[PDB]
Structures are given as structure tokens and as C-alpha cells.
Enzyme design. Structure first.
Site, PDB file in Angstrom:
ATOM      1  N   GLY A   7       8.042  -9.588   2.514  1.00 48.71           N
ATOM      2  CA  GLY A   7       8.645 -10.269   1.275  1.00 48.71           C
ATOM      3  C   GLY A   7       9.444 -11.470   1.695  1.00 48.71           C
ATOM      4  O   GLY A   7      10.541 -11.657   1.420  1.00 48.71           O
ATOM      5  N   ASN A 128      21.566   6.239  -8.543  1.00 51.29           N
ATOM      6  CA  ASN A 128      22.246   6.777  -9.950  1.00 51.29           C
ATOM      7  C   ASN A 128      21.913   6.707 -10.991  1.00 51.29           C
ATOM      8  O   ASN A 128      22.649   6.212 -11.957  1.00 51.29           O
ATOM      9  CB  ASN A 128      23.545   5.939  -9.564  1.00 51.29           C
ATOM     10  CG  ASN A 128      23.306   4.350  -9.735  1.00 51.29           C
ATOM     11  OD1 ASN A 128      22.189   3.953  -9.517  1.00 51.29           O
ATOM     12  ND2 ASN A 128      24.400   3.670 -10.308  1.00 51.29           N
ATOM     13  N   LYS A 162      10.736   2.950  -6.785  1.00 50.95           N
ATOM     14  CA  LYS A 162      11.454   3.216  -5.244  1.00 50.95           C
ATOM     15  C   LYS A 162      12.028   4.539  -5.145  1.00 50.95           C
ATOM     16  O   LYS A 162      12.501   4.749  -4.074  1.00 50.95           O
ATOM     17  CB  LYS A 162      12.636   2.207  -5.194  1.00 50.95           C
ATOM     18  CG  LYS A 162      12.401   0.633  -5.601  1.00 50.95           C
ATOM     19  CD  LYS A 162      11.692  -0.234  -4.337  1.00 50.95           C
ATOM     20  CE  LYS A 162      12.765  -0.320  -3.205  1.00 50.95           C
ATOM     21  NZ  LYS A 162      12.052  -1.192  -2.054  1.00 50.95           N
TER      22      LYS A 162
END
Ligand SMILES: NC(=O)c1ccc[n+]([C@@H]2O[C@H](COP(=O)([O-])OP(=O)(O)OC[C@H]3O[C@@H](n4cnc5c(N)ncnc54)[C@H](OP(=O)(O)O)[C@@H]3O)[C@@H](O)[C@H]2O)c1
Ligand SMILES: NC(=O)c1ccc[n+]([C@@H]2O[C@H](COP(=O)([O-])OP(=O)(O)OC[C@H]3O[C@@H](n4cnc5c(N)ncnc54)[C@H](OP(=O)(O)O)[C@@H]3O)[C@@H](O)[C@H]2O)c1
Ligand SMILES: O=c1c(O)c(-c2ccc(O)c(O)c2)oc2cc(O)cc(O)c12
Ligand SMILES: O=c1c(O)c(-c2ccc(O)c(O)c2)oc2cc(O)cc(O)c12
Ligand SMILES: O=c1c(O)c(-c2ccc(O)c(O)c2)oc2cc(O)cc(O)c12
Lengths: 324, 324
Positions: A7, A128, A162
């Protein structure tokens, strides 16, 4: 010595590359369309490109594609990640590839027999995303797939991808004794070298540009500078004793306090003193870099810096207006 | 005579209120926050705001809340819609109150006993969200809820909440004999009087900004100038023969023709002459406005007019930069 960086064209990885060749590495940049002058010019203009930089043409969606990049090096910094571009079928667009590609790269890293260590760049949304914020987060914490799947809120596919991609990763690294670090950035902000508005700064700058859809990711914000986060990666390749995960968050504050700080710096922009649903009593959430900072690493940058760099470069590149 | 306009502070809503006043009407503008300077300034500044414009506090997430403002009106233009702002739970944030809110706006009209017609602003995402695209869409096409729900692509809550909203309404209007019209715009573009960046302009201005997340909506794109869209809301309230649904799109070209079209007009913006996954045999999906033109409605503005209204108004106000 040689390292890969996937990337290479993008916001983090670019800066990662310039910093990697401002040291004495010789790097193997991987991109998808080598002929996209936007994605590439900034990487080749980098001092010491002619003698040390090489480019390789790989896609996470294409099984096998990374072998050659990874052949030879002592490191791979997997920074790359699919967006939800075509926006019909995220399970096949964003998740399958982010999972399979990741494991893909781990296989290819073994095949090499040269890779001493893999650094996954991961996402804060693996920590989170749950219905109720802990007041402080750390590397034992994992976002909730039950909650993500049930709810299907905006940007669920970049959370679930992810989280399944890092999860299955360790599941292999433990199973086949691969040397895996992973850094978990919070909102990366700073100056930058790439041609266009980086994806993370459409969000950080949202208290200026008024792009409502972003407000949620900074309602209870956490931040790093692009230059700490980068040097942070090279730290964790180079620093021998590192295990497990590494949160890399240097600040944390609710939308209002970031707003305050932009108003005082930038009067010429008309920034709101009010935001819907955010009282003054709303508790800031914290992402703790204590594990990072324990090793020796030391944040050089403050919220005021990240932002000056973002605003300065955007202005320069004529991406933001000079004023309202 | 007196009409209602729900969400008067928006892009569409506000400009429709400017047009209705100018044409002789008396407007009961509704908003969720009248204490919000930015939403309400552009409405009180309208000529004839003093005498022909009152303001009301209503929120689709509050049952009953539109009774007062709907009371007394001959017509009601229900344009306001919830955004995925918190982005925690779109079922309860977006969908429930689109739908409940819509049915609530209907019962309120029935019970005002002077409402002779209610024009609702639907969305194009009610018509054409399905796996494979038809080359032309009209008033008989509905989106595929199996496919929005099986896949949960970006924007899926915006599609579903409007498709169940517009559906449930028709089922109601029929059952109770309510005069009812809906207008399906397409990505609306043009000038404006709101003081912040209109959310849909964040999409039409994507080629200039490099907003990679918003290309899917303009990949096989369609358009309508804002001023046409408003004269058509008024036209369809005032036209006694009008029945059922009514498409309001006036142009239809792939992202390549838009980027090309802008490139010739704005050389000072680097606009990419190439788009990933978009070849030149990618056909254009048209929204047949023919039902509306057969009544006698006449579109007055070209693709270029819209994008020079949106570009100018932004440059003036300072939300797009002057150049790259
Ligand atoms: N920026 C932040 O605040 C933030 C926060 C936490 C974590 N992260 C993570 O940080 C990493 C980099 O983010 P960034 O903002 O620097 O991203 P970025 O500027 O958009 O770069 C992402 C890169 O990944 C590449 N890419 C897209 N699809 C790909 C595919 N199928 N195969 C290989 N490469 C692909 C693109 O390169 P090409 O166009 O050359 O293919 C692009 O440059 C990602 O892992 C992301 O999840 C970002
Ligand atoms: N713009 C387009 O190209 C496009 C295309 C097709 C259809 N449409 C539709 O046309 C309508 C207006 O679009 P627009 O571009 O003018 O959008 P907008 O600019 O964002 O306007 C929407 C308005 O809705 C009000 N609102 C938000 N949440 C609400 C809630 N929960 N209850 C009551 N009111 C609420 C807001 O006013 P306050 O904050 O002051 O309450 C806001 O100004 C929407 O129904 C939209 O989906 C738009
Ligand atoms: O990769 C990203 C990421 O991790 C988060 C994030 C940050 C802090 C959190 O607390 C959280 O839950 C998510 O936001 C983002 C916002 C963007 O615009 C683009 C990104 O690429 C990310
Ligand atoms: O809108 C975006 C977004 O919300 C995220 C994101 C947010 C939080 C996370 O934790 C995460 O992993 C990703 O990434 C993106 C990446 C892009 O290239 C483009 C985007 O438009 C987004
Ligand atoms: O991302 C967004 C989006 O896709 C749409 C959209 C798309 C198709 C439809 O049919 C529709 O009604 C809305 O609206 C939005 C409105 C906002 O205020 C903010 C957004 O970020 C979006």
C-alpha cells in the site's frame, strides 16, 4: 537490508517509505496499478529512489501475488487495505480480501525463508466497537462482532474486516511460529506527501469542512501524528524484544475540545461552538500507548502539530480552501 | 394560501421555501433546532420572511410532532429525512423514524382537514438498488430489499429507510383515500442558499475533491438541477391531474463523461481522466422522467448549468478551493 511495504501509494505507507529510505533501507514498494501517476510520482521523487526503491504489482484479492515482493527481505510492513469502493457486496469486496490477503501475506512470508518479522498495520475499530465505551482501552480488548453484525452501522465492513483479519492472523502466527507484531493506530493525522486528500484527514478535518458523516469517529476522538506512527513502525521492527499488539495513540479528546483547539488556531474558518448530542460532561475515551512507551519509544508530537501539518499541507496542495 | 415544508433548513427544503414565498405562498417551515443560527439564517433572510414565513419545531423521531405546523395548510411538502449521525444503530436511528415520521406526517394531514395534497420527496435509492442494473428506470421500479439486506453495502440504511417509507405510505394513502404524490429526484446539483456544504454536493463534487467513497453513486450517474426539482415540487402540488409517483431526473452520464465534462470547464482542478473499474463501454443508466414531461413540465437547465451553479456557489462561500 531490504524490507517490503504494501500500500506504498497511500497516506501512511508513503511516509513510511520516505522515512524507511531516510535511514538506509532499500525497499520493495507494492501498489496495484503502477501506471497511476497520482499513486506513484510521490514515491519516486523521494530522495534515493533511483538506487534503493523498487515497485511491485500486487492485490490482496489475488492469491499468491505477494511472493516476489517478499522474496529476499528481512521485513514486510503490511500497511495496505481494501476500501468499499464498488459498494455492492462488502463481504466479497472488503472482508474476504482483507482476511485472505493478510493470511496470504503470512504464508508468503514463511515461503521466503528470509523474513525475520511481519508488522501488520491494523485499525482502531478492532478495539473499541461495542455498545458501551470502557473509559480506557488496551491490547487485550477486541471489538464485538455480535454487535457489529446485529447492528450494521456505517463502516461496519472496515471494523469487521480488520477484526477478522487480525484475529485469524495471530491464529496462524501462534500455530506456525511466525514473528508477528501489529500496530493499532487511532486516527492518523499530519502533514503528508501523496497527491490527494488522504482518507483519514477527510475525517480529522471534519470540524472545519462540516462533513457530518464523519463526526461519529471523533465524537470521542483518539489521535496519533503520521510521523510518530511511522517511526513507531520502524521502532517495532528494529526493537528486538517486541511481542503481541501495540496501540499507538498519543492524544484523546471529545469533538468539542478538538473544535475549541481548531477555533483558537484557525479563526478564518467558521467552526461550530456546538455539536448535537455532545454535552461538556461527555467522558473522553482513551487509547493507551503505555505498552509502546514502555519499550523506549517517545511521542515527539502534539494534537496542535498533527493538525497544523494537515491544514498546512491541504492548503498547499489546494485541497482545503485558505478560508471560509 | 399556506403550505408546510418539513426540514426547511436543508438544501432542497430551503430553496423550495424561497420559491414558494416568491410565488405568493405562506410557508410554515419546520426544523428540529430553531436556536441553530446556521440552519435558520438563510430562511429569515428570504425576502418576505417577515410576513409570509412562520417557523416550527418538529422531529420525525417524535410521534405527534408535526400536527401544529400541518394545521391550517392546503398543501404539505414533506422533504426532511434523518441522517446516520450517531452511526450506532441505523434501524432505530434512520429507518424507524423515516417510516414512523412519514406515517405521522400522513395522519396529521388527514386530521388537519384542509390538506388537499401532500407531496413527499422520495429518493432514487428507492428505485434502482438491485444486483444488476436495468438500462432504464421509471415510476414502476422499486429497490430489492432482499439484496440491500443480504449484503448491507455502504448506504443500505438510506435505501431501505426510504423504500419502506415510501411503500408504507402508499399502502396508507390508498386505504384512507389521501391525495398523495411522491417525487423521486436523482443526485440533485446546482446553486444554493444554505450556508454549509450540501451533503449531495459532497458527492457531485467528488471528481474535484477525490472523495473515493462517493464514486459508486455517480459511476452510472443521473442528475437534476435544484431549481427544476423545486419548480417540479410546486408544479406537482399545483397540477390537478398529477397522481402516484413522479421521477425527476434530467440527464444521465457515466463518471467518465462527468469528469471529462468538468475537466474542460475547470482545468485549474486536476481532475483524473481515468477511473478504476470504469471502461468506456460502461453504459449509462437512465431515469425516465417522461411521465413528468408528458404532463407539460419542461426542464430548464443542463448538466453544465448545475455544476457551474454548485462550483460558483461553493467558491463564493469558500467550501471548494479556487484551484489545485
Ligand atoms: N489513517 C488512519 O487514521 C487509520 C487509522 C487506523 C488504521 N489505519 C490503517 O492504516 C493502513 C493504511 O491506511 P491509510 O489511510 O494510510 O490508507 P490509504 O492512504 O488509503 O492507503 C490504503 C492503500 O491500500 C491500497 N489498496 C487498496 N485496495 C488494495 C488491495 N486490494 N490490495 C493491495 N492494496 C490495496 C491502496 O494502494 P493502491 O491504490 O496503490 O493499490 C492505498 O494506498 C490500513 O491498514 C488502514 O486499515 C488507518
Ligand atoms: N440532495 C439530493 O441529491 C437527494 C437526492 C434524492 C433525494 N433526496 C432527499 O431529499 C430530501 C432533502 O435532501 P437534502 O440534500 O436537502 O438533504 P439535507 O440537506 O441534509 O436536508 C435534510 C434536512 O432534514 C432535517 N432533518 C434531519 N434529521 C431529521 C429528523 N430526524 N427529523 C426531522 N428532520 C430532520 C434537517 O434540518 P434540521 O437539522 O434543521 O432539522 C436537514 O436540513 C431528503 O428526503 C433526501 O433523502 C436528496
Ligand atoms: O482506520 C481507521 C480507524 O481505525 C478509525 C478509528 C479511529 C479511532 C477509533 O476509536 C475507532 O473506533 C476507529 O477511523 C478511521 C477514519 C477514517 O476516515 C479512515 C480510516 O482509515 C480510519
Ligand atoms: O469512511 C471510511 C471509514 O469510516 C473507515 C474506517 C473507520 C474506522 C475503522 O476502524 C476502520 O478500520 C476503517 O475507512 C475508510 C477507508 C477509505 O479508504 C475510505 C473511506 O471513506 C473510509
Ligand atoms: O452517504 C450518504 C448517502 O449515500 C446518501 C443517500 C444515497 C442514496 C439515497 O437514496 C439516499 O436517500 C441517500 O445520503 C447521505 C446523506 C447525508 O446527510 C450524509 C451522507 O453521508 C449520505
Amino acid at each position: 537490508e531490504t524490507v517490503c511495504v504494501t500500500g506504498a501509494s497511500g497516506f501512511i505507507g508513503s511516509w513510511l517509505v520516505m522515512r524507511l529510505l531516510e535511514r538506509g533501507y532499500t525497499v520493495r514498494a507494492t501498489v496495484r496499478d503502477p501506471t497511476n501517476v497520482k499513486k506513484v510520482k510521490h514515491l519516486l521523487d523521494l530522495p534515493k529512489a533511483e538506487t534503493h526503491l523498487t515497485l511491485w504489482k500486487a492485490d490482496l484479492a489475488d492469491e499468491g501475488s505477494f511472493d516476489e515482493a517478499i522474496k529476499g527481505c528481512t521485513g514486510v510492513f503490511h500497511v495496505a487495505t481494501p476500501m468499499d469502493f464498488e459498494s455492492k457486496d462488502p463481504e466479497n469486496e472488503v472482508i474476504k480480501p482483507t482476511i485472505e490477503g493478510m493470511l496470504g501475506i503470512m504464508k508468503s512470508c514463511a515461503a521466503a525463508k528470509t523474513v525475520r518479522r511481519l508488522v501488520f498495520t491494523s485499525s482502531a475499530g478492532t478495539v473499541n466497537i461495542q455498545e458501551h465505551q470502557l473509559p480506557v482501552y488496551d491490547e487485550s480488548c477486541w471489538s464485538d462482532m455480535e454487535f457489529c453484525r446485529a447492528k450494521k452501522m456505517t463502516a461496519w465492513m472496515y471494523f469487521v474486516s480488520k477484526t477478522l483479519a487480525e484475529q485469524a492472523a495471530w491464529k496462524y502466527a501462534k500455530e506456525n511460529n511466525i514473528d508477528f507484531i501489529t500496530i493499532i493506530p487511532t486516527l492518523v493525522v499530519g502533514p503528508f506527501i501523496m497527491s490527494s486528500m488522504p482518507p483519514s484527514l477527510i475525517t480529522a478535518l471534519s470540524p472545519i469542512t462540516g462533513n457530518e458523516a464523519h463526526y461519529s469517529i471523533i465524537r470521542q476522538g483518539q489521535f496519533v501524528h503520521l510521523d510518530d506512527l511511522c517511526n513507531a513502525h520502524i521502532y517495532l521492527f528494529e526493537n528486538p524484544k517486541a511481542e503481541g499488539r501495540y496501540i499507538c495513540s498519543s492524544h484523546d479528546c471529545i469533538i468539542l475540545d478538538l473544535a475549541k483547539m481548531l477555533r483558537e488556531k484557525y479563526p478564518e474558518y467558521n467552526i461550530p461552538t456546538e455539536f448535537k448530542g455532545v454535552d461538556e460532561n461527555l467522558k473522553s475515551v482513551c487509547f493507551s500507548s503505555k505498552k509502546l512507551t514502555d519499550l523506549g519509544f517517545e511521542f515527539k508530537y502534539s494534537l496542535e502539530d498533527m493538525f497544523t501539518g494537515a491544514v498546512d499541507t491541504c492548503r498547499a496542495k489546494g485541497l482545503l480552501p485558505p478560508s471560509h
